[PDB]
Amino acid sequence: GLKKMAQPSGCVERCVVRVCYGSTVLNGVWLGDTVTCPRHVIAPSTTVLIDYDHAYSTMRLHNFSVSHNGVFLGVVGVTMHGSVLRIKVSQSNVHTPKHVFKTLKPGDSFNILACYEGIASGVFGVNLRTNFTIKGSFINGACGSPGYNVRNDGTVEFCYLHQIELGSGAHVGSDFTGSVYGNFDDQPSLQVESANLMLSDNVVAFLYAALLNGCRWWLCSTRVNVDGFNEWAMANGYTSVSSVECYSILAAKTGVSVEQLLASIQHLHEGFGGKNILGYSSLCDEFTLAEVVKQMYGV
Amino acid sequence: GLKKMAQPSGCVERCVVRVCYGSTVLNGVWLGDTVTCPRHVIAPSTTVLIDYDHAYSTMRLHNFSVSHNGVFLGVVGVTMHGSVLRIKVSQSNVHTPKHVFKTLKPGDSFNILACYEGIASGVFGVNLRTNFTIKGSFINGACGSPGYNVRNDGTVEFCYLHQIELGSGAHVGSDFTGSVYGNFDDQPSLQVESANLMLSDNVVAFLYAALLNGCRWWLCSTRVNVDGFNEWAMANGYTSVSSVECYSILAAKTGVSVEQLLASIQHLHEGFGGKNILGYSSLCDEFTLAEVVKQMYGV
Ligand SMILES: CC(C)=CC[C@@H](O)C1=CC(=O)c2c(O)ccc(O)c2C1=O
Known part of the structure; x- marks a missing residue:
């Protein structure tokens, strides 16, 4: 699940x-x-x-x-x-948590606390997309809403401050040093973000989750190595895939290698037509490897 | 969005x-x-x-x-x-919120604070389905995780304590009086929940939300009345639609009556034609009327 x-x-x-x-x-x-x-x-x-x-x-x-x-x-x-x-x-916040500041990279997941007039009203997880925007749920007043992660030892990483909504509805923020992600300008203008790429590392984690849930109608027996897949990825709206050995816990179970999944992605790239994977009608890049492992085994 | x-x-x-x-x-x-x-x-x-x-x-x-x-x-x-x-x-919790206890009804949305060994690890919104289960993310140790809603006045409504995962992966809990939702047994057994229905009230809310985003290719010009739709709903796995009152705020801003949406549901019942509505390829009963209003308008 x-x-x-x-x-x-x-x-x-x-x-x-x-x-x-x-x-x-x-x-x-x-x-x-x-x-x-x-x-x-x-x-x-x-x-x-x-x-x-x-x-x-x-x-x-x-x-x-x-x-x-x-x-x-x-x-x-x-x-x-x-x-x-x-x-x-003129006073210190006595409930200041142990914290650091971290700048996010595309593919990073984090948490948004949606705030209005200094009062939190919602919290959700998001992914920084390749075009340096996020798909939030913000209305008027959410400017300055923070993004954060909590590390394993309880250190909060502050990484995002909401700045603006672009015309397409994409949301833009800055880090706590004041750099805007993707170097958009922090005032109204006609700027347009670049095309969204599918996060290949998340698609791989997704397909390993499908496997651990007994869903394997889509598995390919062909193998595409990382260099080949990365070359294909450029041509088809996908990022390069980072590494293979991060997944070796997942490849020991299931018995399927990353290169079979990369082949599977190239096969499923059109669509599943007439079938779903874990209830999804196309390839899902919403979940990271860390999320899949954490939600499945508590690691 | x-x-x-x-x-x-x-x-x-x-x-x-x-x-x-x-x-x-x-x-x-x-x-x-x-x-x-x-x-x-x-x-x-x-x-x-x-x-x-x-x-x-x-x-x-x-x-x-x-x-x-x-x-x-x-x-x-x-x-x-x-x-x-x-x-x-022998100690009172000095941080006890203003709170009440409340029993959920099918179609109600609420929040789960997933906990392990007395420590919160995650928070997500869910919807009580018609078979009185939810689709959450729990692993070993999560039992007793609470579900809650926060009212406008800041009153916390406590409505759910996580009890058990069923064979299908669906999740079962009780309220704070000790009644198990759906009267499942609170122990291992082979119980199978009855099939789920589509919550029409939520589907209507989701179609109003799409109209507010300009997604309206799906709009039927025709209408069905409540009695005709409910008779159709019985024989197609949908709940009865409530009244047309509640949707005043949405019918007013859209100029689209609920009867047009009920007709659109019958048409969209099978197949979007490959097309899409707000990121979905079939109708969605995950958002209530109150959620749609709060996210589009802050009310
Ligand atoms: C004791 C037997 C060998 C298996 C018990 C296991 O199935 C179980 C674990 C659990 O933690 C739990 C709850 O926490 C709450 C209700 C509830 O039925 C359960 C459970 O049945």
Whole structure:
């Protein structure tokens, strides 16, 4: 049974604050005596291109309002770093979890805490796609919503701050250093993301899960090695496949090698027509190897 | 766009405890000075039908261990209520949320906090199906994982305690009064659940959601009334559609009555023609009316 899940959100909920500047409202993340939020909060109300360097120089501390569960925090100073602000506040978050900052790469899964006016309203897992966007569920007010993973020892990795929705509906964020993923611009524009590629590492994990669930009508006995598959992948909307030995736990059971699965992918690439795999009508790239192993065996 | 989300889990994480009896270990829920957990924890280790009234009679309080974050609570007394135990402990949970207990009905959505040895590991939303099972992701140790909903006022409704995985992989739980949903037996046996029906109320919500995204190739211009659809639903594995009242918010913004959607369901009943609606190739009964409204409008 494969169910997309989120890791528990309680320790991140204690770090979400409401950040207001003039009339603009979004979410920030409060760690120690620092609040990080998108710099969109200081943007003037206008249609034209925003000049964030100008807005930053004309910024006044007293125009800020930062609160946690209605309790307001004093603003001491502010600095700009790419597309985020670092707001120093007059008290430390005593519920700051043990944490680090990590930048995500395409193929990485993580957790989104969807927040409105500094209040979490939902949590879900997502994958950073090859075009550096995610498929979230956001409405007006979710700017600054955090993305995170919890490591095995309980260290939270903060990796994402929601910034903007593109015209196609794809969602874009930044890391906590202020780099926008995919280097989109953090203001409204006509930018379009590149084509989505199917994450081959996730498709392999998916097919190993199908095998462990007695679903093997689709198995090919042909073998395609990694170099060959990677060459085919370029021609057909798939990423290269990373490695084989990560899957050797899965190849010892099932008895099927990664190269048989790679051959299977090339065979199923058209579609399953008249059949499904684990209830899916086409190849699923939603789940990582880590997810499959964790949800199946608790590792 | 429609994504299955959970409500944040922080307030429920602080209620989850590790209940041990002899060598048997599972999860419990600590509210005030009561821990509620499945009665399987006092089952003897055996491959025969378990007589729970006898196990309850031979029970000894000193055999229990109840802990939170490796901190042990004193057990004061235990009573049995259907498939659950209520363990009184000598400490009250100081983080007990404002809460009620609620029994789910088929078609209700809720949140699962999946737990192992008293520690939350994942959170996901699910839907109670017509055969009173859910499709979750649980492995050994998950029993006693709680399901919940959070109301507008912040009241947590506790509605589910995970009990058992069936032969088909479907999951069975009880409410906090001890009744097993669907009256399955809370122990190993060969029980098979009756087949599932399509929740028409949810399918209608999902088609309104598609209309709000411009996906409307599927729209029938014709109409069927409620009585005709329900007669059709009986003979095709669909639930009866409720009323047309609830969909006022959606019928108003779409200008599409429920009767047109019921007609569209009959047409789309078999086959989308290879085509697609919001990422699905067949109709979807996983989203309720309330979920669609909250995700499109925040209400
Ligand atoms: C004792 C016998 C040899 C097998 C028991 C196993 O099947 C089982 C494990 C379990 O952990 C559990 C619960 O936690 C809750 C209800 C429930 O029936 C169960 C179970 O039947």
